[PDB]
């Protein structure tokens, strides 16, 4: 499916690169670093790839068992899950928390697996830049249908179901193909989001993809600060403030940890349009 789709013309950068992990007292050092920059900024905003659903078995692109790196010495991705089976990650959960307490603006994803959206994260507050694999739109009215199953297409293609708004339109799936241009409506949401941040959280992407991998740029060109957390150098290494080389889960969960805040049950696929009004959160520490 979409490996098959962009595996020809398309660009997959640098595949393979080696892993690095911060030793544990580093490792907790930064944590507590980050939990300081969230405590101490008014306009948060993540950027998510594919790194954040590899604990859930979904393989990424250019790890070293990711997609391209795989495909280069001629081996298949190995999944652990089909995507309607997927759970989302401790790091998917945590997310959905910051939102509720409103220590999350905006999140911003490159993946198309439908995991965001499936652990209960308003869509109003999302912006997927390349597609869901659960999403179908009406070519004629614009109406999305968030689906319990993968759309068996992907190209921006019919997928064969009609619209049923009181219209007939013909339903095409979301997944951009390399040529085609991101959605006007989300990229022009996540460009305005990375701009008006004080901070951008990255969280599993190489951010070797255009233009998705430099939204965050956008929010250190206005004086804001840049988080990455990555297991593999990114392409932007040299603009972070600070760069955790970690698994994002031990990540999250020291994080939430250090904000006081449980990472919340998840009740299997649910979808929620719009953000609901913000939950109550622990008082904030003194720093210095
Ligand atoms: N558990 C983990 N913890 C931390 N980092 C991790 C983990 N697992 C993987 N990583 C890192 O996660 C990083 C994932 O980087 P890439 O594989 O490029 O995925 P993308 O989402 O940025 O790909 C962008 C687009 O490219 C495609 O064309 C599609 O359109 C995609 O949307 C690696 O550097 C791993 O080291
Ligand atoms: N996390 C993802 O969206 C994804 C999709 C397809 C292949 N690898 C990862
Ligand atoms: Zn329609």
């Given at each position: 499916n979409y490996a098959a789709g962009l595996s020809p013309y398309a660009d997959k950068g640098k595949?393979?690169?080696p892993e690095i992990f911060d030793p544990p007292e580093e490792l907790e050092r930064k944590v507590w670093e980050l939990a300081?920059?969230?405590?101490?900024?008014?306009?948060?905003?993540f950027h998510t790839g594919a790194g954040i659903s590899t604990?859930?078995?979904?393989?990424?692109?250019?790890?070293?068992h990711g997609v391209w790196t795989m495909e280069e010495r001629?081996?298949?991705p190995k999944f652990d899950t089909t995507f309607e089976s997927a759970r989302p990650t401790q790091t998917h959960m945590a997310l959905v928390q910051?939102?509720?307490v409103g220590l999350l603006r905006f999140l911003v994803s490159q993946n198309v697996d439908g995991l965001h959206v499936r652990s209960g994260f308003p869509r109003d507050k999302l912006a997927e830049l390349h597609g869901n694999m659960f999403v179908e739109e009406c070519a004629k009215c614009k109406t999305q249908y968030v689906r319990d199953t993968?759309?068996?297409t992907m190209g921006l293609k019919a997928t064969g179901r009609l619209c049923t708004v009181a219209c007939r339109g013909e339903l095409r799936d979301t997944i951009l193909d390399?040529?085609?241009?991101?959605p006007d409506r989300d990229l022009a949401?996540?460009?305005?989001?990375?701009?008006?941040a004080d901070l951008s959280i990255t969280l599993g992407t190489s951010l070797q993809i255009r233009p998705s991998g430099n939204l965050p740029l956008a929010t250190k060109r206005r004086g804001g600060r840049l988080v990455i957390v990555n297991l593999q150098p990114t392409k932007h290494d040299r603009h972070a403030d600070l760069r955790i080389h970690g698994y994002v889960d031990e990540v999250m969960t020291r994080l939430m940890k250090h904000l006081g805040l449980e990472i919340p049950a998840w009740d299997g696929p649910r979808v929620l349009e719009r953000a609901l009004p913000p939950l109550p959160r622990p008082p904030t520490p003194k720093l210095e």
């Open positions: 595949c393979g690169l300081r920059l969230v405590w101490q900024s008014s306009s948060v905003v604990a859930s078995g979904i393989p990424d692109f250019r790890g070293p001629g081996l298949a910051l939102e509720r993968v759309v068996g390399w040529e085609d241009s991101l949401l996540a460009d305005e989001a990375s701009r008006n």
